[PDB]
Design a protein around this ligand. Structure first.
Ligand SMILES: [Ca+2]
Ligand SMILES: [Cl-]
Ligand SMILES: [Cl-]
Ligand SMILES: [Cl-]
Ligand SMILES: [Cl-]
Ligand SMILES: [Fe+2]
Ligand SMILES: [Fe+2]
Ligand SMILES: [Fe+2]
Ligand SMILES: [Fe+2]
Lengths: 359, 359, 359, 359
């Protein structure tokens, strides 16, 4: 268990950006700029800094050339400069490795703290950032698939309750989760900014980064991303979807960048800012929990995720999940799922929905 | 080969309605009226007559109670009264059984001809029909999932080229087809009204009715049907989709009625009314041909379809397809599909796309 | 009265393209290509040939540099080469000037007939056209405002019944019209291809070209055009809309090109292809007939329209309308409109709706 | 000036509900339930309690039968029970009349404080509320025009800077405003929940309630409300729109209920939750500030608004604005607006845009 520090948690506003290590910067640029239409805040031969349509901070995504594709940092903005000091004292009390840079780790960020957190993830906390032109009314630039906000991160970790408790002490509030009747937790979603999630935990071998999620305005914008990928003959890089989520109620799509980093496109979840916001727990065997329409969850969604780096830039050792596997209990040979709880009609045993088994 | 008659083909306007035999009229009403929102033109203890939002003829769908669920008639409207006589002479020349009723077979249709066509399907030709209130601006009635038009039928038949030639002689023009490089045709689409299809042929054991398709205005209307089916906890009745088709370029969904009759929801195909409209041939191994995003085609889509009746009300005998199976050559154990022609990367050998095998 | 020829009418398929004379080819290119996203089939120093997303014929719009901005030709495609001969015989019997060129008047059109028609309009009829890449699945090119089809023309002419009879003899079928209770006709809509219109007549001084209309897939595509024009700070070139039409039921927008040629953007009218398609007549004083939401029709919509050329390239003389003016009887100082017939509440006397008078 | 209390401000979460007095409860029910599709949380012969699709608190709107149509209370939810005490001490220090009811003023609200605030408005502050079924995934109940959240209030007050400072002291942060070069403020928008606004100030005679605003998911949902009002032949109750706002960037519509209370329908503004969220100031003469497409602002929008009640149920005296009138300076006889600053082309002098003058 991870103890609650005496020191106050930093006041976290929201997820703000991710730094991803990529192996071929030009191929990654093609994906994020030419395919997905993100906006360049800065670039050179080593890095590309990208932002969404409605953003005013310097960036939502930094692509950094390196030898091994991995998550380098997932960054949260905090409310005040003093909250960076609070973050440092908090993670020091947790016994975590920290590194403080008064002029930032990446361009367009000022005083910043990076930590190897108790779950092995590289978190950054910062307040100071260079403001840029907010493009929210630049409809002369608007793409049919425009990505308008950074919405959330999702992390793979082996013990979800342990991670959940730690994030709760850090001020995140749980909105939704997936459990079974004999007390296993498979996933949890948690927020600071008044949407369903700023980060989320997926049970599995970790630390690994499951995905980074961007929003669109409308569902048709997500459809267009799929259509464009078909036209570019890269439909093999559409991993899963499009769909409606059960958990979060958002319309969604998962796609894979050139290094296999997973990107979710997302829209139209609900407001969670009231302190008594009702939590929702789904049963793991409910075949509408992940895709509301009952479409099968592609197996790579459960098995594949990105490496994460420590503060020296080396890959973090993976620790194996010992709790039950969501894949195995739902779509594996001994798994099952239901459409209506207790009804054999519309249930699936030893395979996925819609007539498929695992390949 | 089916010969071209000397007698002139009737001038067919469009698909107009289907008559489906259903086993439980109330259960069927719940699906088509309460779930899908079709508009009742007439009903009694034996039949329900339904129409789409923009229709002015009496109905697009007749549900008739009977002992064995089946297609009873797929009806095409012809341009003039005299075209019903032309239809009769044409099919008599073809050696087909015909039945003429001056006051119709169903309510709201006048003089009508039903035939057992050379592929064993029950076709109706009529001109006369009772006009009803066209609901096209009745936005006080408009559903978030509103079905606005009848679009097409799709027929399963064992020998696609044989059927195609017959339909071309009858005046349908082929818009798209699926073939391989070994001379096999797997499917064809053909039209009279200015859209991709009024009917279509899917290779398989037949005669069977694959589906009846209705249009929506927009893609979000199809999304809503999925969402509603999730809320009603009948997502098991979503067979396949939603998706973007390769062939037709339409956004689509396939759902199953209480008797397992398959309904497609469809929008935003293209204009085909010019007589030299370019005919598009897709390769059967192209994994973007059916779902442009590369999502796998559910196996029941290839195997399951509705019985059809002869003019005596008895089920037509099924003739087995001897040409290659689209399922087998694409997603079966010796199948193959590609994302990019000539690229091993993004190809699938002996399984479906997105990580699945046949259940 | 324009007499009905003995000679048969050519079988007209659809509206196909317009040739507009523009004064500054680069400024016009910026509007049609950069702002509106139409696709270039061919260009040089004198002409730009443009097509919509789903078109396979060579072009839908030819911009020709010249001294006076005007319609040079409105072109309809006919069913067969022999229909060009029929068109020549038909217009010769009407006593109209004709000009036939076996190799066309513009690039990408073959054997073509241009005529000075009985209403003074430069019509072209052609069958032969160079096929080009149909861009209907080129979602890598798809704009958030994508124009997908050419839909119709709209002509200003002083005597609507006279023009209507002539177009009916030519094979166009009236779908909707606007009249009053004193026997005046203000406008009529008429089709060949099975949508509400291929051309339309607006009562007014003429011959003048009121607009050319292009379709989008969805309503949000029309909204985007507005949004983009706001971002480009050219909202002054949004003339009227966006709205829902009463007549046609289509979602719409009117914008102005650099020479003040009016372009409509249009979507989601209804099917008219049955020969007994019900006609709809609106009263001119019904304030939902042009904008279903009751928004006022901007006065320039009634007063402004483009010059048209004769076959020698000179502007056609304008003949004044003597029938009552739709502007005057609805929104002028002695005008009237209603929301509900017979109800003083929601009616407008001597002013437009929503609190406005004419500027 | 309204001095800042030494007592701490209550921690306000968001706008939560309005209580409107209506004169004919059944007619009001028709509008809000049958036309707009709001969901009933409770009703009797005197009151109707309504909520939006995604709400979990008891209601977002209370309709109360009474003799004079008016705003009875605009309610904000506070973070904790203790914040109701804080509100009481805060307004007592300001010298305002307050009333505390430990069991609430309306059903489904617990301990609540109502105040006659320094601008004459009846504010309520509460924490405790009865949770109800959150309908966010009840797609079986979803309307084509579904209202999904309560978004904001908008208040008419004569001195915008005076009101702005008072609301800033209360914790609201300004996101956008409208000013001129002479230093007049015409309007300001301010938030607690991390959208553009929870309440807003429009310069004018007050206190009056300008509107209550509900969100939709998508722009097409707003279009449907218009279309439905057309079909119900109540387009005269569409006051203004639909449009895109400049200020807020939201897609919008204004409609009028049976007592002329104005309701805005709204979607797709941007995130404001960072503490240094950039504040946007628009010039009053910018014709894209209110409608981004330059459509004219209906004069009733500037002149008409609802009465508000004091705590005895009597109408508050209305104080006239002495600062310049936005109507007069933009669309009145001595007003002007521009499309591009400094360009006479696309400017309007002594009249509105798009060819209209004041009726
Ligand atoms: Ca082969
Ligand atoms: Cl999921
Ligand atoms: Cl398909
Ligand atoms: Cl109009
Ligand atoms: Cl506004
Ligand atoms: Fe996610
Ligand atoms: Fe189909
Ligand atoms: Fe038009
Ligand atoms: Fe507002």
């Amino acid at each position: 268990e991870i103890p609650k520090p005496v020191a106050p948690a930093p006041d976290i506003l929201r997820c703000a950006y991710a730094e991803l290590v990529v192996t071929d910067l030009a191929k990654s640029r093609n994906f994020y700029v030419d395919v997905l239409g993100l906006h360049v805040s800065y670039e050179d031969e080593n890095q590309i800094y990208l932002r969404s349509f409605e953003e005013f901070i310097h960036h939502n995504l930094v692509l950094t050339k390196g030898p091994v594709a991995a998550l380098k940092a997932m960054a949260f903005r905090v409310r005040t400069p003093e909250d960076v000091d609070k973050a440092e004292a908090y993670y020091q009390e947790l016994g975590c490795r920290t590194e403080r840079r008064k002029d930032g780790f990446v361009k367009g960020i000022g005083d910043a703290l990076r930590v190897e957190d108790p779950l092995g993830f590289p978190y950054e906390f910062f307040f100071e950032t260079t403001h840029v032109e907010r493009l929210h009314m630049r409809y002369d630039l608007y793409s049919a698939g425009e990505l308008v906000r950074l919405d959330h991160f999702n992390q793979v970790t082996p013990d979800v309750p342990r991670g959940r408790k730690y994030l709760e002490d850090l001020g995140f509030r749980v909105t939704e989760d997936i459990q079974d009747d004999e007390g296993t937790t498979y996933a949890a979603w948690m927020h600071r900014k008044g949407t369903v999630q700023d980060t989320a935990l997926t049970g599995g071998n970790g630390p690994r980064l499951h995905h980074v999620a961007f929003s669109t305005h409308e569902k048709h914008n997500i459809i267009q991303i799929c259509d464009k990928m078909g036209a570019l003959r890269i439909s093999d890089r559409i991993e899963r979807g499009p769909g409606r989520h059960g958990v979060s109620n958002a319309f969604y799509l998962y796609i894979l960048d050139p290094d296999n980093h997973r990107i979710e496109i997302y829209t139209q979840d609900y407001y969670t800012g009231d302190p008594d916001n009702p939590t929702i727990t789904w049963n793991v065997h409910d075949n509408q929990r992940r895709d509301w329409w009952g479409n099968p969850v592609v197996p790579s969604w459960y098995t594949e995720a990105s490496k994460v780096l420590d503060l020296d830039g080396n890959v973090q050792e993976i620790i194996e999940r010992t709790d039950d596997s969501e894949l195995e209990v739902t779509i594996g040979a001994d798994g099952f799922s239901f459409t209506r709880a207790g009804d054999e009609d519309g249930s699936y045993h030893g395979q996925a929905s819609k007539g498929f088994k695992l390949g």
